Amino acid sequence: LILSIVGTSSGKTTLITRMMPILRERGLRVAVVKRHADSWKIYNSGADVVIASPVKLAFIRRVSEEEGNDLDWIYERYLSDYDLVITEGFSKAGKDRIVVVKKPEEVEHFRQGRILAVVCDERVDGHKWFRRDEVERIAEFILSLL
Amino acid sequence: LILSIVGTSDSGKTTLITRMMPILRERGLRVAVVKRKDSWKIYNSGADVVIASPVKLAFIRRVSEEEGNDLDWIYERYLSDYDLVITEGFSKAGKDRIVVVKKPEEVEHFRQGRILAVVCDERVDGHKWFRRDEVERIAEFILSLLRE
Ligand SMILES: [Cl-]
Ligand SMILES: [Pr+3]
């Protein structure tokens, strides 16, 4: 499953990070794609880099514009083994999304794909509506989607 | 093809790699090097993380210790479309290697795989030999082995 969590400036991050223990406890492997719209010397010289450590691996590579803006390429190439892929932002990709906002009027901004739910403290009309701190229920909602 | 750059000077390995890189790349070779705040928060919470931008992508992910130590596992997941993979270290993995040392007798400590050449300011016996400065010659040597 690929799902976008989108909305206004750090409410999105808190939701993702707070839901994460619950999603992982159910046995999901999860990746999060965040778009920005030494090893540096090596990278800067022309090489893509893997940095390997006992418990963490990092891979930094040049991509063409067409690759870097292509969510489904990124997924097919590197994330095909994951149960759940969540984007933070990547709204233009038109994936089904959860919209996380401060004010209900902001929801309107994010109709670039299908709105599965809205997370807001104030009443949101016209959508399935979760309050920001209902992390368990929102996680359960995502688990239902699969 | 995976080539290790091994030896006694951390800085001299890294310098040889970066000086050679523009020459290797001008041949339209695709090269990768393997070496030993919100995305950090997401990572800590238990997600693997992709940071995407129009021309650069970073994939940060949890591994077991054996996976992270395993060059072939890394090659498969990540590196199968490169024309050349360079390793900075990983001497004990036994890949063919270029050995970069200060003193000729240090060469003896890097015999875990095939020694293709030795980089040393002082002449070394029993191996193909370049000085530290001969970056174009060492780069070409690497291009040559690729074409065989
Ligand atoms: Cl080494
Ligand atoms: Pr309710």
TrEMBL record, chain A:
Listed transmembrane segments: none
Protein name: Molybdopterin-guanine dinucleotide biosynthesis protein B (MobB)
Coiled coil ranges: none
Entries under CDD domains matching the protein: MobB
Residue ranges of every copy of the Molybdopterin-guanine dinucleotide biosynthesis protein B (MobB) domain listed in the record: 2-121
Record-level GO BP terms: Mo-molybdopterin cofactor biosynthetic process
InterPro entries recorded: MGD_biosynthesis_adapter (IPR052539), MobB_dom (IPR004435), P-loop_NTPase (IPR027417)
Gene Ontology MF: a single term: GTP binding
Top-level division of the source organism's lineage: Archaea
